[PDB]
Amino acid sequence: TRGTGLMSANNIIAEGIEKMGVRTFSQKEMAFNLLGLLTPEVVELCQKSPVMADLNGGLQFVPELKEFTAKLRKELVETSEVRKAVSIETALEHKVVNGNSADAAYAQVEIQPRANIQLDFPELKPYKQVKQIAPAELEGLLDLERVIVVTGFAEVGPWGSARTRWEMEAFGEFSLEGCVEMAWIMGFISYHNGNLKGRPYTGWVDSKTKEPVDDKDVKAKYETSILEHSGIRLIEPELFNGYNPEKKEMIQEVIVEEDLEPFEASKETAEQFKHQHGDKVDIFEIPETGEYSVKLLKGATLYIPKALRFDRLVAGQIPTGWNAKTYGISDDIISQVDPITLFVLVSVVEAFIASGITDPYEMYKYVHVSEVGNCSGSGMGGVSALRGMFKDRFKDEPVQNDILQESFINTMSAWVNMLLISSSGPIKTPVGACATSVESVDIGVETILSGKARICIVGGYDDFQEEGSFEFGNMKATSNTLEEFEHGRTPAEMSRPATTTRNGFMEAQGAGIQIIMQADLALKMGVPIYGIVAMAATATDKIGRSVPAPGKGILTTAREHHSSVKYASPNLNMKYRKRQL
Amino acid sequence: LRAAQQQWGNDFYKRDPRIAPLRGALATYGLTIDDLGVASFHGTSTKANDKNESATINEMMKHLGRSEGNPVIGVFQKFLTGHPKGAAGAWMMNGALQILNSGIIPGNRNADNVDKILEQFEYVLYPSKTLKTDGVRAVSITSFGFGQKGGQAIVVHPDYLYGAITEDRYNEYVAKVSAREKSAYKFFHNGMIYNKLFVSKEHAPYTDELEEDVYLDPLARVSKDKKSGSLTFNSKNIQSKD
Amino acid sequence: GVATSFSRKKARTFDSSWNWAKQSLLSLYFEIIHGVLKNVDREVVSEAINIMNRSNDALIKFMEYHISNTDETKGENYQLVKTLGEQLIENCKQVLDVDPVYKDVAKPTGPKTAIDKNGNITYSEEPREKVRKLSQYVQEMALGGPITKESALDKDSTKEVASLPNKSTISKTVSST
Amino acid sequence: LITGAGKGSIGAEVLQGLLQGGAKVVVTTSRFSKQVTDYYQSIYAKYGAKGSTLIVVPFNQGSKQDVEALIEFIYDTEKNGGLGWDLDAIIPFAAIPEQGIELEHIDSKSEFAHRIMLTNILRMMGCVKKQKSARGIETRPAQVI
Amino acid sequence: FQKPWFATVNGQARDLATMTYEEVAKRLVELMFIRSTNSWFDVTWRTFTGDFLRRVEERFTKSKTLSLIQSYSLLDKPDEAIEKVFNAYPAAREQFLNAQDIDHFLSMCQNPMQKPVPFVPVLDRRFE
Structure with a gap:
């Protein structure tokens, strides 16, 4: 049998053997031979006595096959080596007679690709082509202030930006432009221009090593890194303030049964302990320093840190090394706001870019x-802040005084306005949990149809955080990663919609933002138009007692009365409407 | 005129109970129900949601009498990204737009084996590999949240708008885009290599003297300041009779 | 070596052919319209088999639509796929309620070792001169050789598709030869 | 059932044919991984004909426990987390390559190989005999190729 | 002045960022090549224009290809060389200079081993 190519099962000498009038088989031929042996006639045959099939192709009739194959291989080898040892002599003789100057004209200049990352605007056809797809009656029929077009979109998510995400979602792998952008996003390369090792240079460098990188190499050098640290993967504790779902910190209440070793506490801190425990604690000044001594007594109440083991070890997380500073956001902002507010700002700037x-x-x-x-x-708002006000205030850790403002769902909308837009437009922040981003587009349309705004910035955003993931895994809404490891599933293949074995959703983080405008406005400003928003609607389901149970509310977006469908309405005819206009 | 265009071109179905708000919104641009090629599904990958979504969409298409053997092509984006709760739709929308302006319908690459129950839904196809079509005309984004939140949004290929305008206005637009597209491309690459895509505004376009003046004049616009080189409200273009 | 690998929980099932049919038609249909596949390629006939083997009502309806709504004016490709579609619908209607058949239609290949002037050895799977079909492969295998003695494909695939369901009666066996 | 049907093998082309022919096939893989399940899904989505099922299971033929557990898995009723199938054919192509190992060099590797390519074949045949005799199945014998 | 403002196209003041790759290459041939004598004023200026055309090809090629400008001697007929390079890569006729290809152009402008360029390519510190 001839396995793959060249070396495998001595394919090179196979033709040699065939010369002796023996047949060698491709895998497909030898597979057809074996499947012959499951045809009814051979099956019923095999049920009577054993059957010895010989699919050898007559090779049994070649004497001393071993030394005869060895012989053939020897003649191919010695003919290949002789013609190599003659081509290498003729090369040397050429190089000695023509030197290095007549054999230098044969060396061509290779061009190596650069990344030319395009904004991927929609291609406008010539007017004849775009006039043919729509009915000829449409011209002057529509109120172009009532037609909502999408003018610009971006996102920030496990696969980077919309651009990269698309490449991954469509072609299962990055181009040159993708690999570069993903590298740049995740920090694996910065751009240098000026003195490098004194010598003037322009282009990408590694961020760690400050070594020149060329675009052709950025795939080879950082594809593995990028694919490994992107997408759905094992939760990283760096990206969530050391949160490890393996060792999830709890505390536990114990009644102290024997006095504690007296310890040092400032006056205020001691008096705080005294107000809490009352009689169950004894405070005493130490005259020398003025610092107090605290002693817990029998029957006091102490909190022992334990540690729990949570079974949701995987999640869709923004690529390791993503950083608002990269996009140009200042540290005074990054400090002040919840990471969610970074994803939103970067989505809004990048959505405007895409919009022109x-x-x-x-x-x-x-x-x-x-x-x-x-x-x-947003569905859930600034959950980093909420953790910083409910756990990290309770644990008297140093938290900014204005954490409450940052927690509020509308704050991300506000922070855009305060840094980028500086409008005085309608500000409507919908909360629809998973459906928020669609409730947003619905509101946006209605806001523009009402006439109150000509442009709205719609979209959703949610962060992922310890307390969420824990409470999602308690409801059993998320996938249980230990069940998936028992099923052999790697992380990458744990979100498997419409499949038989789906048991729970992978939780992810990041934002998406669209810019919607009236068509008329869009045409006037000359902004690209990635699609019309023909319809957006929301709908609650029905009377029940299970809040997370999805229903058939949205079915109502197809209601129509079919009692009188005998003669098609003249209203559905475009010529009729156009005449009446 | 606009209200006349509205009554016939745009909002001809808002009273008629023989036209489904989906049917109408496609019919506006002279598309039949059979033109909704792709449905972007919520597709969380949970037992309950995925069967109830598929049943819903299958029943919409079956009521609106979408032709037998013309199933919507489901796209389950969330195999790749995971489910980011509130931002889920806003990813799907981006995906829908990318589908429209490419003709490429991605494939759920984790769809190892489509659940046997979903067979009963004729109008829904569950592809496991990217299909390069000759063009999509419309995309249905459907989400279902916690608390009976259930959304839908249709998105129609932009080329059915250009139908609506004249050759001259089209040509003016195409020019103005091609110019903006170039400026944007410039600003993008500059930003990316010097880490300055984001530039926080230090000032409102209006000074605090003009704040109220600008709010109260509906036809107040910004005009290129000659010195600063920015866009600012000038005191001669607020309550301007011109 | 003898570490236990097997577990029941790691079994992956695949049984959703009813779905993969429609994708496999839709891919073929767009491969042809973009011109990735031509009327001469054997790969078309393969896909037809792999579609006919998966035929049901639901598939036939899905073809009937996607083909009858193809506008043959839009280029030579669109007339090609509309002709091949109608054929493929007729074939699937015939073999509805017939058993699915393992039929190979690939090109049988023979080894080919080339040594160039420089002495580089290249192997290739060259299409055999005599045998071009599995039906001819069998006949070649029947006749043996001198050592074993003791004392419409590639030209018009659309036609070849038509002849898939039509069970060809073997007039005389290859055993007799 | 079919063991040793890795990618680029005789097995693979046998499997293709069987699916294409409506056979319900339980293929085994030594190196069970994402890449392998993705390949087998591609195969079945290409070829796998109406009323054809493909079960891919990880499985180390060189283990006796794994052979017994597999055959139990095929024969156990669905209710007991099995398949509840009666094998019609067994195709044990599973192997590991040995090269340059003459008589004097026979060691661990060669003994293990032998256990995959002989002994455990005899164990599978055994286990199939014991599950078919357990349920009094007498008229549905399992063709072994 | 004897060193014009480089980023002019048809007497209109622009900048490097607002010029297409074509418009740059033409403006190089307009200022650094001589019509009357039909020959590059310098040799290093021919080299500088080649290094700009091979950068263009690098920026718009899709894979490892063989440069159309194999030797800079082909530029001794410049308008044909331009036409030939921008016919292979017709995208570069409409796209503006990438911010990387502006920085590489200005790093070439301050090459010490070449006759200075006969134009002011930017107003910054080094304008003097």
């Missing part, structure tokens, strides 16, 4: 400051 609008003020050349809304929203 670099300086948002440009939008106020064409609209009044009261006409640019922000109908985006």
Whole structure:
């Protein structure tokens, strides 16, 4: 049998053997021979006595096969080596007669690709081509202030930006432009321009080693790193303030049964312990320092840190090394806000880019400051802040005084306005949990149809955090990663929608943002148009007692009365409407 | 005129109970129900949601009498990203737009074996590999949240808008885009190599003297300041009779 | 070596052919319209088998739509796929309620060792001159050799597709030869 | 059942044919991984004909416990987490390559190989005999190729 | 002045960032090549224009290909060499210079082993 190619099962000498009038088989041929042996006639045959099939192809009739195959291989080898030892002599003789100058004209210049990362605007066809797809009656039929078009989108998520995410979602692998962008996002390369080792240089360098990188190499050098630290993967404790779902810190209440070794506490701290425990603690000043001594007595109440083992070890996390500073956000902002608010700012700037609008003020050349809304929203809001006010205040850790503001779901919308837009438009933050981002688009449309805003920034955003993931795994809404390891599933293949073995959703983090405008406005500003928003609707289901149970509310977006469907309505005819206009 | 265009071109179905708000919103741009090629599914990968979603969409298409053997192509984006709760739709929408302006319908690459129950849903196809079609015309984004939150949104290929305008206005637009696309491309690469895509505004476009003046004048716009080189409200373009 | 690998919980099932049919038609249909596949390629005939073997009503309806709504004016490709579609619908209607058949239609290949002037050895799977079909492969295997003695494919696939369900009666056996 | 049907093997082409022919096939893999399940899904989505099932299970033929557990898994009723199948054919192509190992070099590796390519074949045949005689199945013998 | 402002196209003041790759290459040939004598004023100026064309090819090629400009001697007919390079890569006729290809152009402008360029390519510290 001839396995794969060249070396495998001595394929090179196979033709040699065939010369002797023996047949060697491809895998497909030899597979057809074996399947012959399961045809009814051979099966019923094999049921009577054993059957010895010989699919040898007559090779049994070649004498001393061993030494005869060895012989053939020897003649191919000695003919290949002789013709190599003659080609290498003729090469040397050429190189001695023509030197290094007539054999230098044969060396061509290779061009190596650079990454030319495009913004991927929609291609506009010539007017004849775009006039043919729509019905000829459409021209002058639509109110182009009532037509909501999407003008710009971005996201920040486990696979980077919309651009990279698409490449991964469509082609299961990055191009050159993808690999570069993902590298740049995850920090694996910065861009240098000036003196490097004194010598002037321009282009990418490694971020760690400050070594020149060329674009052709960035795939080879950092693909593995990128694929390993991107997407759905094992939770990293760096990205969540040392949260390890293996060792999830709890505390536990114990009644102290024997006095504690007296310890040092400042006056205030001691008096705090005295107000809490009352008689169960004894405080005494130490005259020398003025620092107090505290002693817990029998029957006091102490909190022993334990540690639990949670079974949701995997989650869709923004690529390791993602950093708002990269996109150009300042440290005074990064400190102040919840990481969610970074994902939103980066989504909004990158969505504007994609829309062609670099300086948002440009939008106020064409609209009044009261006409640019922000109908985006979140399901759960700034959960880093909420953890910083409920756990990290309770544990008297140093938390900023204005943590409450940062927690509030609308704050991310507000922070956009305060840094980028500086509008006075409608500000409607919807909370729809998983459906928020669609409730947002619904609000956005309605806000623009109402006339209150000509442009709205819609979308959703949610962070992922210890307390969420724990409470999702308690409800049994998420996948149980230890059950998936028993099933052999690697992380990458744990989100498997519509499959038989789906048991729970992978929880992820990040934002998505679209810019929606009236078509008329969009055409006037000359902003790209990635699609019309023909319809957006929400719908609650029905009377029940299970809040997370999804229903058939949205089915209502297809209601129509079919009692009188005998003669098609003249209303559904475009010529009729156009005439009546 | 606009209200006249509205009554016939845009909102011809908002009273008629023989036209489904889905049917209408496709019919506006002279598309039949058979033109909704792709449905972007919530597809969380949980027992309950995925069967109830598929049943819903299958029943919409079956009521609206979408032709037998013309199933929507389901795209389950969440095999790759995972489910980011509130941002889920906003990813799916981005995915829908990318599908429209590419003709490429991605494939659920983790769809090892589609659940046998989903067979009963004729109008839903569950592809396991990317299909390069000759064009999508419309995409249905459907989400289902906690607390009976249930959304849908249709998104129609932008080329059905250009139908609506004249050759001259089209040509003006195409010019103005091709120019902006170039400026944006410039600003993007500059930003990316010098870490300055994000530039926080230090000032409102209006000074605190003009704040109220600008709010109260509906036709107040920003004009290129000659000195600063930014866009700011000038005191001669607020309550301006011109 | 003798570490236990097997467990019941790691069994992966695959039984959703009813779904993969429709994808496999839709891929073929777009491969042809973009011109990745041509009317001469054997790969078309393979896909037809792999579709006919998966035929049911639900598939036939899905073809009937996707083909009858193809606008043959839009290029030579669209007339090609519309002709091949109608054929493929007729074939699937015939073999509905017939058993699924393992039929190979690939090109039988023979080894080919080339040594160049420089002495580099290249192996290739060259299509055999005599045998071009499995039906001819059998006949070659029947006749043996001198040592064993003791004392429409590649030209028009659309036609070859038509002839898939039509069970060809063996007039005289290859055993007799 | 079919062991040793790795990618680029005779097995693989046998498997292709069987699926294409509506056979319900239990293939085994030594190196069970994402890449292998993704390949087998591709195969079945290409070829796998109506009323054809493909079960991919990890399995180390060189273990006696794994052979017994597999055969129990095929024959156990679905209710007991099995398949509840009566094998019609067994195709044990599972092997490990040995090269340059003459008589004097026979060691661990060669003895293990022998146990995969002989002994455990005899154990599978055994275990199939014991599950078919347990349920009094007499008229459905399992063709072994 | 004897060193014009480089980023001019048809007497209109622009910048490097607002010029296409074509418009740059033409403006190099306009200022650094001589029509009357039909020959590059310098040798290092021919080299500088080649190094810019091979950068273009690098920026718009999709895979490892063989440069159309194998030797800079082919630039001794410049307008044909431009036409030939921008016919292989017709995208570079409409796209503006990448911010990387602006920084590489200005790093070439301050090459010490070449006759200075006859134009002011930027207003910054080094304008003097």
